[PDB]
């Protein structure tokens, strides 16, 4: 073949993105990690997808987990392997030493199994194979130099055979050896490592394609999740800056605010509402979510602080009976503490839920509520995933944030999200004549014009009331004014 | 079979939550940890609850712990394991060594053993099996490869007998290798990790469902404790956000306050009293609890800075009679330094103290006192756990809090409980003509209206009173207001 | 028995509360540690107390140290181990190798020794046993496996004879495994790790009860102090928020100042005196320390910054004389560099000195001098130690602190010692018309009225004099006043 290397899509969401095509055909790939990174699965689901998507008969070589169970478990994702076993579209080739036997059977069986393996490829006319825990095969009695030669025997053959392989391997250090013997490493053409790194009690899964000989791939670890629908990696690094941009408008929910933005927000932008605690934000969100239920166009509300009944009561006080909203299925409300899942499972449920209610708007009440306990970056990386999907996805977005410090909050945001939104509305407390009076102002809008005036506003059983600006004050922004009361021009 | 993997219910508080159902039935679940982590308990509590909440007889294997003691120790949790074996719903398959050395019996292992076990199982209808410290068996002279096959031949047979097992291991490095030989992680079907991390000078026990082959489970490490009633895990990440929230209102205890709050505190919410030291907090607490008792409802005051005595005094000086509330069975003053337990243990002392008195009011004097010493990240999870529980039990709670800075305190909290609370009160000092004056202020009140004004707050013998506001000042929050006068 | 575990007291200062009761009866406890931690001192102290308190004899197996050696060191605490051996109350079993040369003698090992131990137990009707340095025993040629067996043999045998035991082990890394081979860790019913953390050229020994089978014990480590009285532990968490309270009051030494506090300091109260350097804290203490002698009461004043001579000095030119106090025995000045004792000691140095002279009042001149080279937490504890003691012991304790910054200290304490203290006084600077004027005021008092004003006081020959406030001035706190006309 005088042409470049040929790859093969695994149909594993996000993987074929990282691999600029996917596992190279004809060559064997090595995927390893510690006890639980998803390996077993990464192979199984590597085969399944093949069957169901191109009917490329798979051959699953075990070594420890009994064949019987490899199925019993695989039904957790809705994969009735039993079937593909009947329909000869996949052959589970048992190779796990029974409860008894003898010893000193070194390379003895390795030269045979390769005769057995070629049998299922030959017979079932296979194309994709996946040996799981090849490691427990050397877990008999062998040195490092002993491992490099038993493997190279297999891959060798399989490359002649032409089959495309995947090998499972165990590791004990998350960022250390690449496999117990640190030898398989240079016995593969491609090495992929799966990591389930701990951290402050939080578990984060990731995947990295260390090497793929003769081609390009995505360098670095990528957060993946294991769910009811198999390994799902999120190439938050992939996704291009190919976002749609319409000039159309939508109503903020406050006619007097819709003005201040030159006519509203854009059907293709991210709106950030920031302020100290109790500035309005939650109200905003609500008057944003509601304005969507108005024009009978479903939308979602993601509240991570308040709850089911607490958001009804509190909103109902401002008017807007959310009740009829859920009924006329033009608004559904999620809710759940951020501590209920890592930003990996969250980012997901976001998109996942968006794919069943088909939004038009979307409001995340408190962004700083997610950020909680998570690392700086691990968070920015979360905005992007959200701000990104909900932009190339026609979804308008409203993100609420709390500047951990009032009257003096020398910055819209604190996490540095400021530079990834299209509109910056900020609510702040102003101390006028010994009283905490609010003040909303449109800080920025890349598209439209928007008002540049700082205006106070009061909350009421009526909702937001954007009143007059502080036409006669100074240092207003700080929060601690100093009225002018200038003696005119002295007559 | 075509179904998913059905899990048995351990019956350990919260474990099931973490495991999502329980131990994969008919399968071998693992449980290793450094010594003193709990294991043996967990693997024993495994049976007892089963054999007494479902009735499934159990055969507890033991490699080192003698049967007498395995029974002697269990009397630590009030469990009579003697009985269970006096009825055939439990069997101590004593596999402990004998003080007579004797080489050659190392082979009889597994194979000859396995039969013993099963022989027992059969003689009891054993549904659950807890083999403790299987690791001390190959503590004769075995390799890493050797053990793998030794195990592969131990789980297998037990997997066959269609019985659910509990394998207990041990390790050394707290985070390092999961189980001694780095073989039990990849060889097992279920792996549980019992850690007893030092982290400072205190120790925080924690459990982790590392991996359950075939199903889902709570990823991560979760806090837990061992008490007379056994293991007690608190999955402060699996508590739903379905907090019953009504529109009722209880009275704060202070009249002028309730007005400023649009008419009082919602019986279903969490109040946060924050402010420089000396401002007032503890008072608002004492006046909070006074009320619960005036309406003859119960209330608990978890004190973390003063003794029951110094606390009763402070009250008399303010008018209310805590001395009474103690007998009129309408007040529980707990008292205990924050250093007397890891938050892990306190959350429970509280959780327990509540459902031992069903109070309508819970006061936590000085949340800061608890946070001193601990991380800010471990603090937030404690507040959340109490902020949450407190709610779910329709209980109104008042949490104190001292801001490490007096005056010019721009951020409510330096900690940032700020957003996880429903009602925020704010006391602060203000100089006015060479004199420190107190100043109350309702900051946010989610459900209702509430008064903006920042009024002067006077403390005296007759309790706390609210005077007028600093209506003619600029930068009153700055700690040093400039007096202006505008009149035609 | 159909009950819980039976525990035996050790009387080892504070251990019985950390272990909740004592060491589990008829069972062996392993006490490990790196060299110089205190193990033997723990082992001996046990048997020792077993005798002098409960007339309970004990067997002490010594694998390495010589018998006459054990006896000798023991004297460092004033314990006549020779005598207790002569009264047949304790037996030092000597399993120490011969200074000569022999490889074929201990061929019947363990089993052969056990009979001895098991003999002695009965010959001496001993109730307690402590085996010092088992490690050194098989430290010959053994694996992680050859130990677990040998030991378990001994342990079980000692369990059968119903002997409550103590096995001592060595370690290498401080927070590394619990014992040399990683097996005693589990053949033992109970685990005790003695540490010796050396953080910052300073050493701090602490004890932890890893595990006690079927019972309760405080988790984590507590710091201890080997002293002439042997092991002494302080579980600054095993203390209770249960101290006697009151309304009775006491003078401050400064009349005026007492009025601003509702009429004196409470008695059961801890007073904090913060303020920039040079604000007179030292002048309040002395005055406070002195007022206790006039009324005729015993008060202590621990120093950490000024000597004894400089103290008596400045205290003279300020009027009241400290000398007289000492003579009369109505006062006692300590003195000692913070650096010359590890807090936990100090804490104790104070406790004893307290138990010595029995004080009504105490003056800790500068907590924020002890705070030096110590961690926020390590110190936050030292405080709770003394603060919570003076209370349960009903003492009038006035402490001193220094705000690291002058005029404008946007806070009271940097280590937030407040909220633990009852009454906070506050001396600060004020720049008025090119001058450095002083300011004093009560920032909080828990059970009284106290003046809410910021007064200016003048220091001079007679002492501290408090005057009136800065009415017509703004920003008095930021240090830079703004006389507004
Ligand atoms: N339906 C599911 N939903 C969510 N998570 C699941 C589901 N099924 C399995 N998991 C998770 O994925 C893991 C499965 O890993 P798997 O058994 O496939 O192989 P491995 O971890 O790579 O290697 P090995 O388990 O043999 O050591 C489980 O440990 C669990 O955390
Ligand atoms: N019925 C009402 N009448 C008058 N004011 C109300 C009413 N309900 C709520 N408010 C006001 O609205 C604020 C509630 O906070 P809000 O709903 O704006 O959420 P937020 O500022 O976004 O977030 P956070 O929960 O952190 O404060 C209160 O501070 C209060 O002053
Ligand atoms: N009634 C009880 N209340 C509180 N804690 C207890 C009680 N009983 C025992 N404990 C604690 O639990 C621990 C007991 O652990 P356990 O002996 O059951 O198993 P393990 O430490 O996991 O493994 P192993 O002891 O076999 O090495 C002790 O360290 C002790 O502190
Ligand atoms: N009988 C009383 N009469 C007048 N004022 C009192 C009386 N008792 C207490 N006070 C005042 O109340 C305050 C006592 O502290 P308080 O009960 O308010 O708790 P806090 O300020 O929240 O916390 P902390 O006590 O730890 O400083 C003091 O500032 C004091 O001036
Ligand atoms: N009278 C004493 N006063 C203060 N410290 C003492 C006194 N006597 C001994 N010490 C200290 O106590 C320690 C004694 O340790 P000990 O002999 O008890 O056993 P160990 O250190 O646990 O084990 P090993 O000595 O066998 O290595 C010494 O390191 C020393 O610093
Ligand atoms: N005899 C004196 N006459 C007048 N003023 C004095 C006299 N002695 C000291 N002072 C004043 O008191 C201050 C001394 O402070 P003092 O010795 O009381 O302790 P401190 O300021 O609390 O702590 P530190 O000495 O560690 O700074 C000096 O700054 C000075 O202005
Ligand atoms: Mg696997
Ligand atoms: Mg909110
Ligand atoms: Mg145990
Ligand atoms: Mg065990
Ligand atoms: Mg306070
Ligand atoms: Mg207080
Ligand atoms: Mg909010
Ligand atoms: Mg010694
Ligand atoms: Mg000083
Ligand atoms: Mg001084």
Numbering used by the authors:
A (entry chain B): 14 to 504
B (entry chain C): 14 to 501
C (entry chain D): 14 to 498
Lines from the paper:
The circadian clock of the cyanobacterium Synechococcus elongatus can be reconstituted in vitro by three proteins, KaiA, KaiB and KaiC. Homo-hexameric KaiC displays kinase, phosphatase and ATPase activities; KaiA enhances KaiC phosphorylation and KaiB antagonizes KaiA. The crystal structure of KaiC from S. elongatus revealed a hexamer in the shape of a double doughnut with approximate dimensions 100×100 Å, whereby the N-terminal CI and C-terminal CII halves of subunits are joined by a 15-amino acid linker. Two phosphorylation sites (P-sites), T432 and S431 that are both located in the CII half were identified in KaiC.
To analyze the phosphorylation patterns of KaiC P-site mutants and to visualize potential conformational variations in the vicinity of bound ATP and residues 432 and 431 at hexamer subunit interfaces, we determined crystal structures of the S. elongatus KaiC single mutants T432A (TSa), S431A (TaT), S431D (TdT), and T426N (nST) and the double mutants T426A/T432A (aSa) and S431A/T432E (Tae). b KaiC mutations xyz or mutants KaiCxyz are sequentially shown in order of sites x = 426, y = 431, and z = 432 where the wild-type residue is in upper case and mutated residues are shown in lower case, i.e. Tsa or KaiCTSa, where the residue at position 426 is T, the residue at position 431 is S, and the residue at position 432 is mutated to A. The structures of the TdT, nST and aSa mutants provide further support for the conclusion that T432 is the principal phosphorylation site because it lies closest to the γ-phosphate. Moreover, the hampered ability of KaiB to antagonize KaiA with the KaiCaST and KaiCnST mutants could be due to their altered electrostatic surface potentials relative to wt-KaiC as a result of the lack of a phosphorylatable residue at position 426. The combined structural data expose subtle changes in the orientations of the H423-I433 loop region harboring phosphorylated residues relative to the γ-phosphate of ATP compared with the structure of wt-KaiC.
